[PDB]
Amino acid sequence: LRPIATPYPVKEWLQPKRYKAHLMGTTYVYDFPELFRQASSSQWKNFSADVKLTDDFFISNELIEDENGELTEVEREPGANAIGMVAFKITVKTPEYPRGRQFVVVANDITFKIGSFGPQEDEFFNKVTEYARKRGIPRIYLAANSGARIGMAEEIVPLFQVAWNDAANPDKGFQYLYLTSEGMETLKKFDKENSVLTERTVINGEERFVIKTIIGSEDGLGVECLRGSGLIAGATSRAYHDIFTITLVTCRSVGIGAYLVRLGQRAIQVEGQPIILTGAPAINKMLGREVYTSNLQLGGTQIMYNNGVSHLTAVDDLAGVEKIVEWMSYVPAKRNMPVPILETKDTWDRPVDFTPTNDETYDVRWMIEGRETESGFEYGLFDKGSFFETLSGWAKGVVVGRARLGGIPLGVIGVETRTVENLIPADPANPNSAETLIQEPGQVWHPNSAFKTAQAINDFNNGEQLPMMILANWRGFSGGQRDMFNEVLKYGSFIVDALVDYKQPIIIYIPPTGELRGGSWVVVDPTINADQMEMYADVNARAGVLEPQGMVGIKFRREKLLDTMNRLDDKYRELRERELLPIYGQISLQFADLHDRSSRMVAKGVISKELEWTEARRFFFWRLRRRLNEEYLIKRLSHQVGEASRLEKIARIRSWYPASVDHEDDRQVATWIEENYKTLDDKLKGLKLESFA
Amino acid sequence: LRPIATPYPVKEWLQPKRYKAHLMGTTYVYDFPELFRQASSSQWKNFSADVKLTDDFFISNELIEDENGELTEVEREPGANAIGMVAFKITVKTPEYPRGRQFVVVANDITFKIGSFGPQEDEFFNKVTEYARKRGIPRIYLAANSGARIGMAEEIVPLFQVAWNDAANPDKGFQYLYLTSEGMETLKKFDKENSVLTERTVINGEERFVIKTIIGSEDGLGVECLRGSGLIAGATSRAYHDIFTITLVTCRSVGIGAYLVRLGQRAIQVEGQPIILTGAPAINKMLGREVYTSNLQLGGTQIMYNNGVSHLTAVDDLAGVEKIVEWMSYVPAKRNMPVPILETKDTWDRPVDFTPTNDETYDVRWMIEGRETESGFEYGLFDKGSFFETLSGWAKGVVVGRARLGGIPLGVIGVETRTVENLIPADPANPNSAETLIQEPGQVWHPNSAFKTAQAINDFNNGEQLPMMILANWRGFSGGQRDMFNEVLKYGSFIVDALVDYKQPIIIYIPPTGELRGGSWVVVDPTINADQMEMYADVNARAGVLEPQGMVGIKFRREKLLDTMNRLDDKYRELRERELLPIYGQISLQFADLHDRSSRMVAKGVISKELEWTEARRFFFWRLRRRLNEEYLIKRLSHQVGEASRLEKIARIRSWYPASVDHEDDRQVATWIEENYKTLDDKLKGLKLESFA
C-alpha cells in the first residue's frame, strides 16, 4: 500500500488495474463514466450556471453478457471484467434532452492483455453495436488497444523435436519438426491432442509423429482473431449509416483498432496517442534500417488530424469526452427522432452584424458565429457560441461544423477566402525528400477540400440526421495538372453523390461577397436533390459559367470593342484613338458582370429568392422551421397511405391548410402546423382507412 | 462538291456536318450506330467465325421528343437535330443474347454549337437517362463537347451607353451603363424589354435608363445552363446505381462533360481526346504566365488513365465502341436479369495448368487467364480469352477485370506480386518540381490500390450486378508515414463498405503462393457480409496476424531459444555453444509458420474449405453455379411471402430438396434445381396464399 496516510482510500491500490492504465497514460476504463458525468455537468453549467443538478441526472449501468450471451445491466466492482472489452449504458439529462437521452460507451480495457482484440472482445463489441443499433441510440467507442491478439501453442514449445539432417552438426539444416510418443502422451494426458496435426513415420530407430500443422489449445492466436476483426469492421461500417457513431482515441489504437476509428467516421484523437496500422519497430525491422523513431511519426495527430481521419484533437481524455458530449448536443436522442432544438439568449429575431466586404480580407467564421470587436460583439448568421468546427486540421479551404439557427441545429459548410499554406512534412524513409509547401487559393476546390465537403455532407446525414446550409462561394475546381492528376473529379463527384443521398433539408446560399461559377455550381445545384434542396443568392453575390475576364475573352473580343468605339467621336470620325483600350476593356468586363447578378438568377428560375444578408437569419430561421414541420408531415403521410411521390404528398398536406394560409409565408405555415399537430394527427389516423391492393 | 468522280456519293458533302466532325477528329454523331453495328458484327465473328449474320440482327432507332416532350422513335435524315444532343435505341442480337438485348446511346453533337450543353440538351440527356433507367437498360454516353453553353445579350451590345465621369476624357472611368429612350424603344420594338433591368434617372439634359442587370432574350447564356448541368450530374449519379453506365470520350469533354465522365464511373478515353475542367489557355491567362501548352497536359490519357478516371484508352472511336460492346458482354441485358452465361470451348471440366511457385516471379494474369508457352497454352483458372482487364493504367499493384468461369461472368480481383515503378511526372506550374518514382511493393495495399479495389467491387455490384472472386494475397497495408499521411485507412475502409453493399455472390480465395495477414484479412473476411461472402484457402496458402519474423520477434525471443537449446547436448551439458543462433532462429520461424496453415483455418472455422489450385476451377464452377441458383430462389421467396431473414429463406428452400440431396454437394443441388425450376415455381405460386397482417 502506497502512498500511506492519504485522506481517502487509494483507488490505484484498491484496484491496481487503475494504476496500470495510468502507467500507460490513459484513463482506467471503469473511471470513464465519471468523465461523462463530469462532462455532462459542465454542459449544464455552461448552459445555465444556476441549475440545480443532482446525481440522478446521470446514470451509468455496465452491460455484460448473461449465460445466453444476452446483454444485461449489472453493478459490480471495477476490474471484474473477464474479457478485455467493457461497455456502459448512460442515461443523462442534458439541456437538449432535459428528461434524458441514452447512449452506449464501448471500450477496450488496456490492462486486459494489453487491450488486444480476441474473439470474445470482438463478439462483445459486435453485440454492443447491435444493441445500440436496434435501439437507435449513439455508440461511442473508446479506443485503447494493441490490435488483434496473437500467440503460439505454448504447450508445444517444450515438446517439439527437430529432425536434423546431421545430428551433431545442426548447422546444415533440419527436415521437419516432430513429436515423440511421450510428446503425444503428454498431450493426450492434458486433453490437448487436437493441438497438433501429426503424420506418423518410423525412421530407423523410432516412431516420430511429424508436425504438419500447429493448432493450439488456446483460442485467440491467429486467424480466428482476424475473423472477429472483420466482423466488427463490417458491424461498424453498418452502424455509421444507422446511428450516431463516434470514437475517442486514448491510448494507441492499432490494426483493427485504427480501422474501427476510421469506420465509425467521427474521431477525436488525444494528443500523443497514435492511430497506427503497424508500429515503427516492426516497420524498421522490416526495412533493416531504423527509419522511424516514434509511432507518432506514423499516426500521431500531425498525421491524422492533418489527414482528416481525426476530426478533432484533445489535450487529455476528459477534454475528448467533453468534445463528444458537445458533438452529441446537435444530434437526435435516437434514430429518426427530431433534431434537438436548443434556444439560447441569441434569439432568431435580430439582424446579422458581421458583413464581409470585397475590399477587405475576412475569416468566414465571423460570418458564421460572429466576431469580437473593440466596439463589442458583431453577431454572425448563427447563434452566438453555437459553432462547433470539425475536420479543422485538414483541407482548410473549407470550413465545416455544426451550429444553431434560433436554436435549430444544422450542419454548416463555408469557404475560406484566405490562401492555405499547406505544409507537408518530409518522409523519413526517403533521404531525398524535403518538406513541401502547397499553397491552396481560396474559393477553389482542391481534391482535399472537395473530399472534405462530401465527407461533411455525408457525416451530417448519417446518424446526425441534420439539415444543412452551404455558404457556397467557389470560383471552381483547380483544373490544373497537379490537381487533375490527383483526381479532383473523383472527389468532386462524391459531393454530388452525397447530396443525392441527403435526407433532411438543405439550403444553398451564395453569400454577399460570394460567387459560384462553372464547375462549382454543377456540384451544388438543387436539381441534384429537388426533394431536399433549395438555393438562394445574396443581392451582392455573383454567378454564371465564367468570370467576366473569361466571358470577354470569348464574347467581347478585340474587334467587338472597336465597333464599340463608335461610342467615341475622336474614333467614330475616322473612316472612308486606340489607347482607350484600358477603359473599353473595363467596360466589357462590366457589361459581362451585369449578367452575373441575382436578378438574372431569379429571372431565370435558378434560385428560390434573392436575399439580403442582414435579413438572412430571420428569413432562414422561419424557412428552416417551416421545412422541418412539412417534412414531418410528409413522413407521417408516408408511414401510412403508401405509394405517392413527394410532390403528391406535399400537395395533399398543403391542401389541408386553411384557405387563408399563404402557402409561401414560412412563419405562418409553421405557426399553423404547430398549433394543429394533434388535429393533423386526427386527420392522418382517419386516412388509415386503407383497402389499397 | 469535292472530290468529284467518286464511285458512290460523298457523304461529307451530302451532310457537311459530317465533314465538320471529321475536321475535329471525331466521328459524326449519326455515324456512331454504324460503329456499333460493325462492333457487334465483330463480336459474332470472334465467337463463331461461320455464323450467318443479316442486318436484322441490329437495329438503331433515333429517339426524339415529341410535342409533349415524350421520347419517340423516328427515322430521319442525319443532321436534322434541332438540339445538340442526340440519342438512339439499339436492339442487337449478341452471343450472350442471341434473341437480342437493348440499350441507349446518348451523344453530344460536336457540330451543333460546339457540342455545348444548354438547357435543352441537358433536359434531353436527362429524359434519355430516365428512359433507360425505367426500362432497366444500359446507358452509353458518347462525350464530345465544350461544356456549358455561354453567351451575352447580344441585342444589348449595340444599344448600351456608358455614362462617363468626364465625356471627352474617357480615361478616368465611367459611373454606370445605360439606355436612351431609343434603346428602350428599339427593345420594346422587338418584344425584348425583358432583356434588361433599368432604373430611370434624368441627369441634366435627358432620361437615362440605367442598366441594373442584363438578362437577355436568348436562353442559354449562364446560370440556366449551370442548373441543367447539375440536373444531369445528379441524374448520372443515380443511374450509376441503377443501370449499366458507361461513357466514351471522343473529342474533348469539358466541364460538365468531364463530370459526366466520372459520374457514370466506367469510362474509355480515345487517345488524344482530353477530359478537362478548364482549358490551358484559360488557366494560363489566369496565371499571366504560359504554364501549359496542351489540354492533354491537364486531362489526356496520361492524366486520366494513370488516375483511374479512364478505365481504358482506345486508339480510335471504333476501338472504344468495341471495348464498350465487349464490356457489356459480361453484363445482364437489363437490371435484375441473370448474368449472361457464355460457354466457350474452354469448358469447366479441366484442371488448372499455370501454377505459381515461391521460387519464381509470376504475372498473376497467368493464374487468371493462363499463359502461352513454347510447349503450348497453360490454362489459368478462368475461361481462355475471357479476361477483360479494366483500370489497367492505375494502381497497378491490383489487377482488376471481368472473366468467365465455365461461361459464368464475374468480377475478378487479383494481386500483382511484382514491384510497380509508379513514375509521376513533374508539374509544369512548379519550376522546382521533378518527376518522381514511387516504388510500390507487391502484396501491399497502398492508398491507390485500396481505392482501386473498392472501386472495382463497387463497379461490379452496381449495374454490372456480377458475382465476384477475389484472389486475396496481401501482406497488409503500407503503414509507413507517407502512406498513412496519404490516408490509406480511408481507402481501406471503402473496401469494407463496398463488401457490405454487395448483392451477388462473393468468393474470397487465398491462392497457392499466397497470404493474407493482419490488416489485410480484416477488410475481406466473409463476416463482413455473410449473406453473400465465403472464404477459401489453398493448401499452399499462409495466413495469420503477423508473418513468422513478426511472431518470433514477440513470442520466440532471445531467451526462449536458449531454453530450446536443451535440444542440444553440447549446450545442454553446461549448467551448475551459442552460434547455433542462425539455425535455432530458423527453427522458431518454422514453428510460427506451422500455425499459419490452411489446416488451422479449417480447424478454427474461418474458411469454408481448404482447396487444391489445380482442382479449383471445377470446384468453383459448381459452387458459383449452385450459389446463383439458390440466390434466385431466395429472391423469389422474397418477392412473395414477405418478412424473413436470409437464414430462414434458405432453410425453407433447402427443406424443399429431396431428402437424398446432399445439401453440400454443389453440382447435385444445382442440377436438382435446374431440373425443377418450373416445379418450384408451382410451389412458390402456392405460397402466395398470404393473409399476413
Ligand SMILES: Cc1ccc2c(c1)C(=O)CC1(CCN(C(=O)c3cccc4cn[nH]c34)CC1)O2
Ligand atoms: C488556381 C485556380 C484558381 C481559380 C480557378 C481555377 C484554378 C480553375 O482552374 C478554374 C477557375 C474557374 C473560373 N475562371 C474563369 O471563369 C475564367 C475562364 C477563362 C478565362 C479566365 C480569365 N480569368 N478567369 C477566367 C478561372 C479558372 O477558377
Ligand SMILES: Cc1ccc2c(c1)C(=O)CC1(CCN(C(=O)c3cccc4cn[nH]c34)CC1)O2
Ligand atoms: C512496405 C511494406 C511491405 C509489407 C508490409 C508493410 C509495408 C506494412 O507496413 C505491413 C506489413 C504487414 C506484415 N508484417 C509483419 O507481419 C511483421 C510484423 C512485425 C515484424 C516483422 C518483421 N517482418 N515482418 C514483420 C510486416 C509489415 O507488410
